């Protein structure tokens, strides 16, 4: 833990990280996330990009919703 | 910081992690990301999968764009 309110804890509930201001994860290679359930939330905006394409897929049901949905 | 160029810093600007080669995040349980603005970028490809489905949603506007968009 630091003096600015940033904190990392490893315990019986897994690994928790909190930031006082922001968080930047970078790699020169690939970034791979895995888990049973992946939940991403934003209180303002969510964006995702790929210079060579992007894909969302599932074996069951894909869902796209909003008050307005635009495609190209 | 290590001898191979990998580095983690906690300071007044939040938490920064950089990898010399790659980065692997894994869990036996769920992975939960939160923040005001979540920005994901790739210089080649972006993929996301779920064996029991996937969902993208928002209260305002959903956007899907590319030079070609294919659905099923």
């Amino acid at each position: 833990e630091d003096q600015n309110g940033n904190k990392t804890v490893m315990d019986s509930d897994g690994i928790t990280m909190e930031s006082a201001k922001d968080m930047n994860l970078k790699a020169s290679g690939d970034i791979n996330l895995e888990g049973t359930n992946v939940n991403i939330k934003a209180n303002a905006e969510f964006k995702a990009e790929g210079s060579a394409g992007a894909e969302v897929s599932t074996s069951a049901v894909a869902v796209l919703k909003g008050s307005l949905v635009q495609i190209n | 910081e290590d001898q191979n160029g990998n580095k983690t810093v906690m300071d007044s600007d939040g938490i920064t992690m950089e990898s010399a080669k790659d980065m692997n995040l894994k869990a036996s349980g769920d992975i939960n990301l939160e923040g005001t603005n979540v920005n994901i970028k790739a210089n080649a490809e972006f993929k996301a999968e779920g064996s029991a489905g996937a969902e993208v949603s928002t209260s305002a506007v959903a956007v899907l764009k590319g030079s070609l968009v294919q659905i099923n």
Partner: protein, 200 residues
């Protein structure tokens, strides 16, 4: 003044709070969340019998509220609404929409308006809506969900447009003119809602 309150005993305190010009409310359809900033369809893009519109504001609903109300504007309304449906008739050419009473709603929290009509005449051109509600002893009724809900008694006839259009076009008795064809049914797209309340 400090000297006047040392031995005099306080017995009762009454607190009244009045709030106006609130635009930070939550709006819902049978299809989902609406975005209040932009023009939206109360009752859906294709309104049907039984469709609804719900207004929520937790800051008021958690208080012992005694009065609450809101207003809305419509965007591309026809110049006259009863005349708009003159081509939609049954039996011996009798109009489905006889008069403005056709367009009515039910208020589940029990509105105080004189009549149950949906559109009220705007002092300028076009139409607006107005709704006002009361709670006799500042006690919410049991069984209501602390939301303001209004539902449609009758549809706007979207389901009949194709049928009437066809019949005019294929008539062998008359030559179709533009005045004989049905106009497109109206879906009531709206914007700029404002709420107010009192609690004691």
């Amino acid at each position: 003044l400090y000297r006047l309150f040392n031995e005099n005993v306080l017995t009762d305190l009454k607190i009244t709070v009045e709030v106006s010009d609130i635009t930070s409310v939550q709006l819902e359809n049978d299809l989902g969340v609406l975005n209040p900033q932009k023009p939206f369809f109360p009752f859906g893009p294709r309104p049907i019998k039984g469709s609804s519109f719900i207004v929520k504001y937790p800051e008021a609903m958690e208080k012992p509220v005694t009065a609450i109300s809101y207003q809305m504007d419509y965007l591309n309304l026809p110049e006259n609404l009863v005349n708009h449906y003159s081509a939609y008739t049954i039996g011996d050419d009798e109009p489905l929409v006889s008069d403005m009473d056709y367009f009515s709603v039910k208020s589940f929290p029990k509105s105080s308006n004189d009549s149950d009509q949906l559109f009220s005449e705007k002092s300028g051109g076009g139409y607006e809506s107005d709704f006002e509600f009361q709670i006799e002893n500042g006690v919410w009724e049991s069984g209501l969900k602390k939301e303001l809900k209004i539902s449609l008694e009758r549809s706007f006839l979207h389901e009949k447009y194709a049928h009437y259009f066809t019949l005019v076009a294929i008539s062998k008795d008359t030559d179709p003119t533009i005045e004989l064809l049905p106009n497109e049914p109206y879906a009531p797209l709206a914007e700029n809602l404002v709420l107010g309340y009192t609690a004691i």
